């Protein structure tokens, strides 16, 4: 008669009724994982009909001491309405039972785990949560790719239907923390003890102090919860009048930009017992970890404020008695309000450096332009700079009929054969530039797990400790190609060569010292690219301004040249594949990994969907080489200039000015290195999430169990950097997860038994990390696994790998897709059709690329190099091993003697 006893306590008709997610920290196991539940009894409540409702009555048994302990702490907290009602009773089976009343089926840990460990086809709990709280109907899941952020952006509306329950949970957590502090109770708040109605119920681990002096610990709770706050848009109600969804939006003043008191009020409402200092303006931060911590709170609170409040802050300035509009600051979504320090309100003359700064910034362009309402895109349009809109098109390619007739003469392009034409110059119509620009709708404001990110940044900084960097002078700067673009205002009057010839060394030095105290927001010009591709999509270049690229070369070139010159490291930018470099790279990746497989993954929409927190993190990692040459303020203003110039830049796209939400710029030279930092960051947090979500009770190795126990406390329990544990985790990752990174392309060589046991990351962990931290769905069809290491990685930088005999030993050679080589030969740009020498250099480059096809087992693949060599001989006749018309020239490019 146990059932009528439980409803004998609480008058409610009951029906009686597994893997749940817990945040565990013991002396025995530490992790955020799915565990088994054995000691509980759940009874469900019914409505006015005989239909079940989301109320559950969890009754569990205890000993006598913890029964008295739970009762003596519940009697001090009952008056808080954020506490679930608990019933204490003894039942003779006399065993004391504790009955919690009207809980939901799932806790907040189930929601946080289901969104931070996402798996398609293994997501019954997330579907049940979405159906139970009326975010979507049961039939919604039938649609293919219902979960995909890119192929179905209605899932953002579905998840944003969950944001009002999460805001109520935050409010009830603040009420419960106030009740614990007013009662003198010390405890750790975890997500598994709060249901999806917001009520708290488990009081076993709480101790008692004098009233008024309670301390709740909330680092693990808030920091594990943080990505869900921006995924569900939980602070949407704070833009309405009196925080009510039914009420109309708050009509803010258009002239208002500060929002410091509003940010402090939001922090005090939702994160009152978060114990680290929050600076709303990150100019008042103490180091780079403080910048990351306080910029993570700013990306959540900036979703509340009007989007016209961000960007450059302008101010009327009189140059030689003439009214002028100039930018004297910047309101960042991530960094708050930054003011410039060298602001002169009255000036007599205009020197060349200040004239360059005044021509670069968008203040004088947008203040003299017309208003623009572009309904083609959802991005913020600022101003149309002309009376008309430009619609640029892309022409088709120039067909090379001579090479094609020569190739069909030699027996190519037969149907049913391996090598065919697949790469073309796809032409584009007039709406191509703005519809490519509309792919910045894939960039969403994302809050990271800040305690996890602050550990992952210290592990990622170990991958960059072998290089040297720091500021150089203007006379030490090497410029590779002086014929790059010069950004928007400066391309009217020349390339980047004219601005390096005009400016003195002292002028460039003064411009670089101006950027350590001021923000110069610049404009990026996006143009369509005339290039060959295998897909229908349009390619775009981005021209960053000459001010930005000049000062960024001065800030970053020593480190970038040191990364590009280092052999044997993890980042392989700058390592040539020729002269045995492919073999050396691959033998560096298989370092000493003991049960090795190979693995690659992709980042879908990586240039668009990259969060701003991870780009700021990559910039701070690259700026950590500046401890001697820069002060803390100089490094902050360099970070602020990079955020205003390559992250939240204004984009000139077809005669009009738009606001970029973020993402990388494909014309900045730092983009490949920032992509490598981001790649290592995503791999390290995939390994951290694989190690912390494993049940530690079934980890047989004591070293790995001790490693995850220290990993949890280095994330969530300590706030200093355990420098000795960062070295240990980095050595563990070097031993079992050897990586090769080249700007968002990666192969790893991983211990496969550790990956089957869940001790290092697999493809599943990368999919989960990209889902909760990148707002993309990585399909497994673009990821690969190679179990045999005599075969090389399936694809690295669009290159296949073969193990061939070269001399007396077996060497890894790279080869491309043969269709790519024939398509580059058959379709040719406009400049290569003019001069015949440029065609010979193009065909020599293509025969260099196609030389390792001769060692392929396929004879059809091997004939491509012979076709290119015969066409090169024909081109030479119509016009040592240093002669490019012999195969020895191409054999010498893959032999280790350089």
């Amino acid at each position: 008669s146990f059932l009528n006893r439980v409803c004998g306590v609480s008058a409610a008709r009951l029906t009686p009724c597994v893997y749940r997610a817990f945040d565990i920290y013991n002396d025995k196991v530490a992790g955020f994982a799915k565990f088994l539940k054995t000691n509980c009894c759940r009874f469900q409540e019914k409505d006015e009909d005989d239909n079940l409702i989301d109320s559950y009555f969890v009754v569990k048994r205890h000993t006598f001491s913890n029964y008295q302990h739970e009762e003596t702490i519940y009697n001090l907290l009952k008056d808080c309405p954020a506490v679930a009602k608990h019933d204490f009773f003894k039942f003779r089976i006399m065993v004391p039972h504790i009955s919690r009343q009207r809980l939901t089926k799932y806790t907040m840990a189930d929601l946080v785990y289901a969104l931070r460990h996402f798996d398609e086809g293994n997501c019954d709990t997330l579907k049940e949560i979405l159906v139970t709280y009326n975010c979507c109907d049961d039939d919604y899941f039938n649609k293919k790719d219902w979960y995909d952020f890119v192929e179905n952006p209605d899932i953002l509306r579905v998840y944003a239907n969950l944001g009002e329950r999460v805001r109520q949970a935050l409010l009830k957590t603040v009420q419960f923390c106030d009740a614990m502090r007013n009662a003198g109770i010390v405890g750790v708040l975890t997500l598994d003890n709060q249901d999806l109605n917001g009520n708290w119920y488990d009081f076993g681990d709480f101790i008692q102090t004098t009233p008024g002096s309670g301390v709740p610990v909330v680092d693990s709770y808030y920091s594990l919860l943080m990505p869900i706050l921006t995924l569900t848009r939980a602070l949407t109600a704070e833009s309405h009048v009196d925080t009510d969804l039914t009420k109309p939006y708050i009509k803010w003043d258009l002239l208002k930009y500060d929002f410091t008191e509003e940010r402090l009020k939001l922090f005090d409402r939702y994160f009152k017992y978060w114990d680290q200092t929050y600076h709303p303006n990150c100019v008042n931060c103490l180091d780079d970890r403080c910048i990351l911590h306080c910029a993570n709170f700013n990306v959540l609170f900036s979703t509340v404020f009007p989007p016209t409040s961000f960007g450059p802050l302008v101010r009327k300035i009189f140059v030689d008695g003439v009214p002028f509009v100039v930018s004297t600051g910047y309101h960042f979504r991530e960094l708050g309000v930054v003011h410039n320090q060298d602001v002169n309100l009255h000036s007599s003359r205009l020197s060349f450096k200040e004239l360059l700064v005044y021509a670069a910034d968008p203040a004088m362009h947008a203040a003299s332009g017309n208003l623009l309402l572009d309904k083609r895109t959802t991005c913020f349009s600022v101003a149309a700079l002309t009376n008309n809109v430009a619609f640029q098109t892309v022409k088709p390619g120039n067909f090379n009929k001579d090479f094609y007739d020569f190739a069909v003469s030699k027996g190519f392009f037969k149907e049913g054969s391996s090598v065919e034409l697949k790469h073309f110059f796809f032409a584009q119509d007039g709406n191509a530039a703005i519809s490519d620009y509309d792919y910045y709708r894939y960039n969403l404001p994302t809050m990271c797990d800040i305690r996890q990110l602050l550990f992952v940044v210290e592990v990622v900084d170990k991958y960059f400790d072998c290089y040297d960097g720091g500021c150089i002078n203007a006379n030490q700067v090497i410029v590779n190609n002086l014929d790059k673009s010069a950004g928007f205002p400066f391309n009217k009057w020349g390339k980047a060569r004219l601005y390096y010839d005009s400016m003195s060394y002292e002028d460039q030095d003064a411009l670089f010292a101006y950027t350590k105290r001021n923000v110069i927001p610049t404009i990026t010009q996006m143009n369509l690219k005339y290039a060959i591709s295998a897909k229908n999509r349009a390619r775009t270049v981005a021209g960053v301004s000459i001010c930005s690229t000049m000062t960024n070369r001065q800030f970053h070139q020593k480190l970038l040249k040191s990364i590009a010159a280092t052999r044997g490291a993890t980042v392989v930018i700058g390592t040539s594949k020729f002269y045995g470099g492919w073999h050396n790279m691959l033998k560096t990746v298989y370092s000493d990994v003991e049960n090795p497989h190979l693995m690659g993954w992709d980042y879908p929409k990586c240039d668009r969907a990259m969060p701003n927190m991870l780009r700021i993190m990559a910039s701070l990692v690259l700026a950590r080489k500046h401890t001697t040459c820069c002060s803390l303020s100089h490094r902050f203003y360099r970070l602020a200039n990079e955020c205003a110039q390559v992250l939240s830049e204004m984009v000139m796209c077809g005669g009009s000015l738009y606001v970029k939400p973020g993402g990388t710029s494909s014309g900045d030279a730092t983009t490949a290195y920032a992509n490598s930092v981001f790649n290592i960051c995503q791999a390290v947090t995939a390994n951290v999430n694989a190690l912390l979500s494993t049940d530690g009770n079934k980890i047989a190795d004591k070293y790995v169990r001790n490693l995850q126990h220290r990993l949890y406390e280095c994330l969530y329990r300590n706030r200093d950097v355990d420098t000795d544990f960062v070295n240990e985790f980095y050595a563990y990752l070097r031993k079992h997860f050897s990586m090769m990174i080249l700007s968002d392309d990666a192969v790893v060589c991983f211990n496969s038994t550790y990956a089957s046991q869940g001790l290092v990351a697999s493809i599943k962990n990368f999919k989960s990390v990209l889902y909760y931290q990148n707002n993309v769905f990585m399909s497994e069809a673009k990821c690969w696994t190679e179990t045999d290491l005599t075969k090389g990685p399936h694809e690295f930088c669009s290159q296949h790998t073969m193990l061939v005999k070269q001399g007396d030993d077996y060497v890894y050679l790279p080869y491309p897709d043969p269709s790519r080589i024939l398509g580059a030969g058959c379709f040719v740009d406009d400049i290569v059709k003019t001069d015949g020498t440029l065609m010979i250099e193009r065909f020599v480059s293509l025969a260099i690329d196609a030389y390792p096809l001769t060692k392929h087992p396929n004879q059809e693949y091997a004939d491509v190099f012979h076709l290119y060599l015969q066409y090169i001989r024909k081109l030479h006749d119509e016009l040592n091993t240093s002669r490019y018309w012999e195969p020895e020239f191409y054999e010498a490019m893959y032999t280790p003697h350089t």
């Binding site: 961000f310 450059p312 004239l355 017309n370 208003l371 623009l372 309904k375 083609r376 009217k492 009057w493």
Partner: protein
């Protein structure tokens, strides 16, 4: 050599944009701010005289700029001119549901502030 030529080009451009901008409503907007500092994003939103609306189809045109006057950004805008993507003047009577597969979309509506 090139420094003098680039300096003249940059200087002439700065004056040309300086000459175009109005100084009554721009000083009216700036002086209502406390510290004399305003966001840049509100300067063409509140002080511009022209508005260009790029409209991709008829369904957006019937919601955005319907009639001879429409309301955007808390201002009244009377339509001056409509052109198509081929830069030819489209009359107001040509923009219906009937004739819209004959029009070269997008349409660029130019309006002046009332």
């Amino acid at each position: 050599d090139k420094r003098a030529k680039v300096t003249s080009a940059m200087q002439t451009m700065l004056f040309t944009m300086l000459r175009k901008l109005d100084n009554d409503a721009l000083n009216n907007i700036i002086n209502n701010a406390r510290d004399g500092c305003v966001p840049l994003n509100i300067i063409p939103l509140t002080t511009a005289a022209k508005l260009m609306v790029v409209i991709p189809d008829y369904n957006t045109y019937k919601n955005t700029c319907d009639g001879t006057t429409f309301t955007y950004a808390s201002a009244l805008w009377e339509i001056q001119q409509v052109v198509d993507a081929d830069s030819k003047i489209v009359q107001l009577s040509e923009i219906s549901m009937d004739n819209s597969p004959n029009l070269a979309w997008p349409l660029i509506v130019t309006a002046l502030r009332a």
